[PDB]
Amino acid sequence: MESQCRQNYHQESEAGINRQINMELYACYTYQSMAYYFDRDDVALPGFSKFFKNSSDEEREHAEKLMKYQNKRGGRVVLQDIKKPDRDEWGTGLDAMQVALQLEKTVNQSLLDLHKVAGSHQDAQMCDFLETHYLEEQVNAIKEISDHITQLKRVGSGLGEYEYDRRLDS
């Protein structure tokens, strides 16, 4: 029952998209966890909460665009369990930004590996789709989070973290 759409779309690329979908949803869930961690009364950093809630929404949007792409190419979406996040509590604002940077680098490596799979099969359209809609945003997200980390080291604990939280809330 090969899809009437399918053309130049390798089954390895199709499986890679399904793998990437689960990875994006995993990142979504971790950011959702962080968002409500910073909403705890004994944490109470609403700027960090908003930053990670927005990051969560953006990851969900990335996953759904991959689901849409899967269908466009005639592939078939196959979902797996979304594994719960690595921690239940995420420390300081700086701690969570550090985790976010490693998470974004993990998603980026996964996308770079997916791009290699697509290129190996001369899937020129899928390569450009990944470059345009995924790879550029990862480079921007990693730079932005790195800037946040550097600034959070500069301002220090206590009042410094409070002031940076105001910046994220603004």
Span between the terminal Cα atoms of the chain, in Å? 52
Q: Tell me if 130 contacts its own copies by CB under 8 A.
A: yes
18 binds its own copies (CB under 8 A): no
Contact criterion met (CB below 8 Å) for 14 and 73: yes
The structure tokens 């962080």 sit at 34
62: partner contacted, choices Fe ion, its own copies, none (Cβ within 5-8 A by kind): Fe ion
Tokens of 161: 């973290």
Task: State the binding string over 20-39 for Fe ion (x if CB under 5 A, else -).
Answer: ----x---------------
Comparing CA positions, the residue from 85, 78, 67 lying closest to residue 26 is 85
| 64 forms part of the interface with its own copies (CB under 8 A) | yes
How many residues lie near its own copies (CB under 8 A)? 79
Q: Which does 105 bind (CB under 5 to 8 A by kind): its own copies, Fe ion, none?
A: its own copies
Q: Computed from CA positions of residues 114, 115, 116, 119, in that sequence, does the dihedral angle turn out positive or negative? A: positive
The number of residues that bind Fe ion (CB under 5 A) is 3
Q: According to CB under 8 A, which one of 19, 95, 119, 121 is a site residue for its own copies?
A: 119
Can you tell me the distance from the alpha carbon of 23 to that of 31, in angstroms, rounded to the nearest whole number?
12
Residue 158 C-alpha from the chain's centroid: 29
Q: Rule CB under 8 A: is residue 58 a binding residue for its own copies?
A: no
Is position 160 an interface residue for its own copies (rule: CB under 8 A)?
Answer: yes
Residue 119 partner contact from its own copies, Fe ion, none using kind-dependent CB cut-offs of 5 to 8 Å: its own copies
The verdict on 11 binding its own copies (CB under 8 A) reads no
Per-residue CA distances from 158 to 76, 94, 170 (Å): 50, 12, 19
List, as residue ranges, the binding site for Mg(2+): 24, 59, 62
